[PDB]
Symmetry: D2
């Protein structure tokens, strides 16, 4: 049916926990990235049919955080919006949902992506409404419960990363060397201007003064292998995962204008890339056949491609252990992966992260003249999200 | 373009605030409804491609409440699931999203609907993470902030209902007669068994016994116009809107199995109705040229129908003043509206309500042999959500 | 050295946890008791020199709860007031402090006693001011932390009672027979009007009506040994202490007017009893040479009395195991102990309880014409508090 | 009756809000000052008969904060202890209570004073136990509610200071010049070693490292009149009270060993001063006669003295407005007042403050060879606390 393209792809800088964006609600980050994505695509806000934004920690953000972002961006109040939560998947799954609505014939132009401000997550009192009656109870970290805690196994995401490291023998040393390379690559990318096209500044009107945040602050410049080897395991006595080889808690928004090829032509848009296939795409049989990261595998097959044919790959770094497991199984050429650094250095703003790596992927393909790109994040049946792009 | 149908449609009873469902998390109500929906459709859990569920008060409910409901229902862990939040529109928007995904060629069978437990919403401390420093602060009722408060105008949704009552000149008396009619129709429908097919019982297993909840708790049997006339305004001094002419705060899950017509035939399923059109369908020029209830007008127009041709209508009753404004503008025959009672009597479990009225519409169409049906809820630019159904 | 007397002695009923006094702040119970105590003593508010009141759960009750009670009772704003917290000892220690101030020549008329509303204790967030940073934390039940938890051993006061039961070899059976006897005596005392003189009614004025609370709510009329024998241990697996052989969590105020004998004569007051001695009286060599209940032994010795000479004894029943250990060690004649029932039946409103048993002792001495009385409560080094009274 | 003396007088440094002592609970500060007061008096911990300590913000501190301090100090577990709360009065009123118990013949040696850690005060949820039911509620700053908020007038203490400034015409300029002089005098006192005798270091065992806090940190060295004139009013639009001319929120403990003259002789103690009279002393008539600070006035008269005869005076600086009002009315010679600086510079750790200024007074009398001293704090009938000392 319709071909689907990315007309623009914009993100804020990624802030560190409790730092540069602590005072900027997720919805304002979202609004900042939407306003700019719309200008960068060269379309009018009224050309937009629907807004679809991921956001995981919605607690106390008020009704329909995606709608607030749309309205704050200056989009027409009558554009419908919805907020999606698939945890790790949210921000990228909104892009494939956009492509699906366009394919169904119901839209031509959709704002997609995601936003998160983990620094601002609340604490919760779950039994304040009808009473605790008696006894100490839990004052709930909402960021941990709704974003980072495995609802079924009743342990932290970090434990899952340990399990994978264990089962595959991904050693502490191997994870730290991977973390070091992500740090070095982010530092070079930032210092060489590789993110200048994709970052929209955020303006914080301070008590008096305006502050501009326009640079990713999470990378630890000058990281060394020695510095990483000294860190204590963060999740498990004598484990392999540390602060050093895992991503952080971060704040960002990242937004893309998704359009039918035919509408892009009509509006004089010069698109950046075509969406070729995605993890959600087509149906079955059979699911289990490909192995444990079958989402990404099957998405690659549906595009008619192989891993060797890919020019650039964004494979999210929630934990180095998980990144190394995926790269090993799919036999990625590591020179083509996370070329501007990955989440260990840059940050993992949950609900925005899938969209963030797609924004970094599309600009890197443009910059480096790379024809075939893969963005992939999250691990395990039901959860993997992946998109394949072919540059225009 | 694939034809899309409803293979089953099931809901829990709707509980009242702090009452029959207070001890049953939204995800468990959702799991109960999904497990039954699959059984009623006569399909296996393995036949489901994806789970898409409305839920507005997600705070503290843990990662991806839709995925939790899916898992707790017995559905394969590999089925992808996402949680959607469009406030009032959430539960019906998941049904049209299901149809779009099916139309795009990406799934054949999708569990859609919504779940909410307003009785269990937390309170929040928004500045607990980095500190309050000094001075009293707000202990935030999350149900009001995330479900009921207009994020822009900074007032209760009740105030919007009051403005609509003034706008359309709808009197206190008119609102209470409408409320009384919803109450009477709900009482007669309950007592005549009109909900017996669609309600799945919820079994609450305590430390000492079992309680079965299978009847809608919210209606006030024996309501009278004098009883309604004595009520104090809920939202403002000298207001027209009271607790007796507005819906409540309520707990429910409502799930439908949505399939392509082709898969339904292949699986031996006898579908209940075909989804003919929805407010999201086709693109937006010139959408605001119809009036303020243009999502609903545009959906009816896209079906190729008119209001006079409709046999049954479910038009949600968040507030009698809103229900009457939509009914006057669209010139509904009120004999065909909310024939088994509406949300004033039955309750408004936010992220489930749009699916709950679809579940009620489709069962009522079957029972009454009505060919053409409309479900509509929410009011205002870009919020209205509507679906048109044609009985099989 | 001035002689010191009790001119009046009044208490509210004792409410049960979350029940009859849940809506009445401790300071209001205190104000009700003070206003009546002054009236019963036949003195004017102007005749009071100082207000000294026990209150253990002061959190959030506002500045100087004793001063608030004093003011709300009609006492001149210039009367100095202080709030004392010695946990279990608070309410009786204020009576001996009153006597010391009178003996020192610094006052002639002091309002003493205690007030507590355990039903209204808050929960706490201890790190809200400077932040929790990350991770779940304790939402602290302040009643347990400030009123019931051993700050050193880091366990419930219930565990101390269990250790005392083991120490003194006091069986489950023995504790329940003692509890049943407290229940029976309380039921007979209530029904025979033994508390009618000492209880001041509390009038709760709602938005729509008035409720009068004037009867002790906590006793379980018709208790049986079989009913007690079926109870599960409260504090530890296979424990002897249950909810049926330990006191409750309760709400009360109890106030006495304490005067020099000289002022009482000057004001025309007929005093109820003379305070002969108290556990604080004279200095400490060699205080621990008596046993573990040496405050009580030493008070009796300072009166120039013995246990056999006492006519009535109020020995508080926080736990049956503690009550029985004190009674065995001191060889009390149990026919003279807690003759109108004790705290198992009647409740243990912490910072009021010591004054409440003094109020009950002095009324019982009057009614029964008993010359010599002992009130004792609390156990362990430096906590025990006791007063000896001689009827006028 | 018995003469009463101060055998030793010790305090911690006073920390600023959220600063040097933020990690040291009030009870540990108390314990540190008790252990040292006992050594400085040259008596054994077993010579102590009772512990009486002021502490206003007791919320969540656990049972009987004075007892915890005693136990943590290494005092015998059987010494009875009680915590007093008279807000501003607490710490000094414990010293006069000590003298009263000694006068009554019931003790020879008492530990008195007070402790507070305002940085550590909790936030409160007052309706967590039985439920908020619905609607936003207040997340309570316990420090403000229990320490700084006028329970009767329902406004901040700062408003009272404004009222006094208003009624007496104590101008902004006059208050800032008073604040400047307190700042200069504290700076000279600290730099000249005047507090070295009375400060006991506090040792904070850090993550690794021990930190020593031994210097008052609140003074703003180098303050200037210009700096103070630039500040905005803190309580009232166009008011006179600012951060600059008011004290802070501070953390400290200050403890004194109080003994009978006869026991000091017997134990070979060389006392520092005799307590001559106190605000609580003797009884009436008539109270209103002296004017609004009659507490202090009457205490001065009872010693047989006049204001002119005083050699040194500590008059607390909660707010410069209140200090200037008292000094004007009693016609203090300002050269003899707060000679080492006052609370504006040094801090006002509520429950400790009365004891802190008595500790500073007694050491200053020793240092400067001053025979007659007055300590006074708090304002308004019922609340004024005052003690007169005559040096040994």
């Amino acid at each position: 049916m319709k071909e689907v393209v990315i007309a623009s792809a914009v993100r804020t800088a990624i802030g560190s926990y409790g730092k540069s964006l602590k005072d900027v609600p997720a919805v304002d980050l979202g609004a900042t990235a939407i306003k700019e994505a719309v200008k960068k695509a060269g379309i009018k806000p009224e050309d937009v049919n629907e807004v679809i934004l991921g956001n995981v920690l919605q607690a106390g953000l008020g009704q329909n955080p995606a709608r607030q972002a749309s309205f704050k961006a200056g989009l027409p109040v009558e554009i419908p919006a919805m907020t999606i939560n698939k945890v790790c998947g949210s921000g990228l799954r909104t892009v494939s949902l956009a492509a699906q609505i366009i394919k169904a014939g119901d839209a031509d132009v959709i704002i997609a992506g995601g936003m998160e401000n983990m620094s601002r997550a609340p604490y919760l009192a779950n039994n304040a409404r009808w009473g605790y009656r008696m006894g100490n109870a839990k004052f709930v970290d909402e960021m941990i419960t709704d974003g980072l805690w495995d609802a079924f196994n009743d342990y932290h995401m970090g434990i899952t990363a340990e399990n994978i490291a264990e089962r595959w023998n991904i050693s502490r040393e191997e994870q730290d060397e991977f973390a070091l390379a992500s740090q070095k690559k982010a530092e070079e990318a930032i210092k060489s201007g590789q993110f200048k096209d994709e970052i929209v500044p955020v303006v914080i009107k301070g008590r008096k003064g305006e502050t501009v945040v326009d640079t990713d602050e999470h990378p630890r410049f000058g990281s060394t292998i020695e510095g990483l080897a000294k860190l204590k395991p963060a999740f498990k006595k004598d484990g392999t995962v540390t602060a050093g080889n895992a991503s952080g808690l971060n704040d960002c928004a990242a937004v893309l204008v998704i359009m039918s090829a035919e509408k892009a032509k009509e509006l004089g848009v010069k698109p950046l890339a075509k969406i070729v296939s995605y993890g959600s795409a087509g149906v079955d049989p059979a699911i289990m056949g490909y192995g444990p990261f079958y989402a990404t595998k099957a998405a690659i097959e549906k595009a008619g491609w192989t891993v060797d044919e890919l020019d650039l790959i964004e494979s999210n770094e929630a934990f180095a252990a998980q990144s190394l497991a995926v790269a090993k199984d799919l036999k990625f050429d590591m020179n083509k992966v996370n070329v501007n650094g990955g989440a260990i250095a840059l940050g993992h703003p949950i609900g925005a992260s899938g969209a963030r790596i797609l924004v970094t992927l599309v600009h890197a393909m443009q910059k480096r003249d790379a024809k075939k790109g893969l963005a992939t994040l999250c691990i395990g049946g039901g959860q993997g999200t992946a998109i394949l792009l072919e540059k225009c």
